[PDB]
């Protein structure tokens, strides 16, 4: 007897200032009898290309959680990162070794998180061998180097600074430079970022993040 | 008049009657690969154009080139020439 959308109201999401495009669309909710409780805890996943306006990030998705509401503006925060499934299936190929590392670490803001990085061996310019498998010792050494680099980068930074590092893929450059001598590599990427635990909420840190 | 199998294939080669099967395999018949785009191999020519009656002709040694990714027959080869080619690759 009631069309639900008569009682619904529209709200506009906004993104972190770390991203170039703050506008990421809109959502809707039942009107307060409150709406804020339904809004809080909501997560929206969006490709980095939309937020940064470049197709170079088309294979990367960011999950942002709604943390505050003000005047039909939904103020969100970074919640997670992942790649597109198609990109991952593209990277994995026959005749090469897949090296994967995972690290659990907390930021300077007490944001406990988990980083998954992936990389693949590559054949050199003058290679004539079909494949480029790496000995287990090289795999272990590379994994240690990657874990140390990830831990150093995360611990010595804040979450906003962490995302500021993820967007330009500086960490991948540092990893490949460090692991260069051990074994040549390709497709070095921070595959995934999970947010395990959250500190006590601080609306001030969110407003300052959003300007 | 009568026509032998191998001459018939040569005459039909420049026409649209002749189609080539995939390279044969086995003792004696082996694909000698000069290069990524060159090979020498035996094929079974098919004469005729599944609604008409075509048939396969005697196997013939052919020179095949990969032009535009498809294997195209450049020349026919005698048995002696093919045998010499196989030895020339082995040495």
């Amino acid at each position: 007897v009631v069309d639900p959308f008569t009682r619904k109201e529209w709200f506009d999401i906004k993104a972190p200032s770390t991203f170039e495009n703050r506008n990421v669309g809109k959502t809707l909710v039942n009107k307060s009898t409150s709406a804020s409780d339904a809004l809080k805890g909501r997560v929206v996943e969006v490709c980095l290309a939309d937020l940064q306006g470049s197709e170079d990030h088309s294979f990367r998705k960011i999950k942002l959680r709604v943390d505050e509401v003000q005047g039909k503006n939904l103020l969100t925060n970074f919640h997670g990162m992942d790649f597109t499934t198609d990109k991952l299936r593209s990277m994995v190929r026959k005749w090469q070794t897949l090296i994967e590392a995972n690290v659990t670490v907390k930021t300077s803001d007490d944001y406990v998180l988990r980083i998954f990085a992936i990389a693949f061996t590559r054949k050199q310019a003058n290679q004539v061998k079909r494949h480029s498998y790496a000995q287990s010792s090289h795999i272990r050494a590379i994994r240690k180097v990657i874990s140390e680099i990830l831990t150093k980068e995360v611990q010595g930074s804040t979450l906003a600074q962490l995302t500021s590092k993820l967007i330009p893929e500086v960490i991948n450059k540092e990893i490949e430079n460090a692991t260069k001598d051990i074994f040549p590599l390709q497709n070095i990427h921070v595959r995934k970022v999970k947010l395990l635990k959250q500190p006590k909420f601080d609306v001030g840190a969110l407003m300052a993040l959003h300007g | 008049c009568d026509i032998a199998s191998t001459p018939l294939a040569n005459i039909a080669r420049k026409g649209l009657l002749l189609t080539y099967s995939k390279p044969l395999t086995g003792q004696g018949l082996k694909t000698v690969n000069l290069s990524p785009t060159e090979r020498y191999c035996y094929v079974v020519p098919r004469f005729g154009s599944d609604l008409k009656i075509g048939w396969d002709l005697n196997p013939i040694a052919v020179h095949q080139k990969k032009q535009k990714g498809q294997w195209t027959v450049i020349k026919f080869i005698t048995r002696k020439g093919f045998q010499t080619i196989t030895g020339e690759e082995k040495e």
């Binding site: 310019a125 003058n126 004539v128 079909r130 | 990524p36």
Partner: peptide, 17 residues
């Protein structure tokens, strides 16, 4: 020279073949 790269390619084709 860059002709060296061509030699790598054809050898690669041989090996995989």
């Amino acid at each position: 020279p860059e002709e060296m790269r061509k030699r790598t390619t054809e050898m690669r084709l041989m090996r995989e073949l």
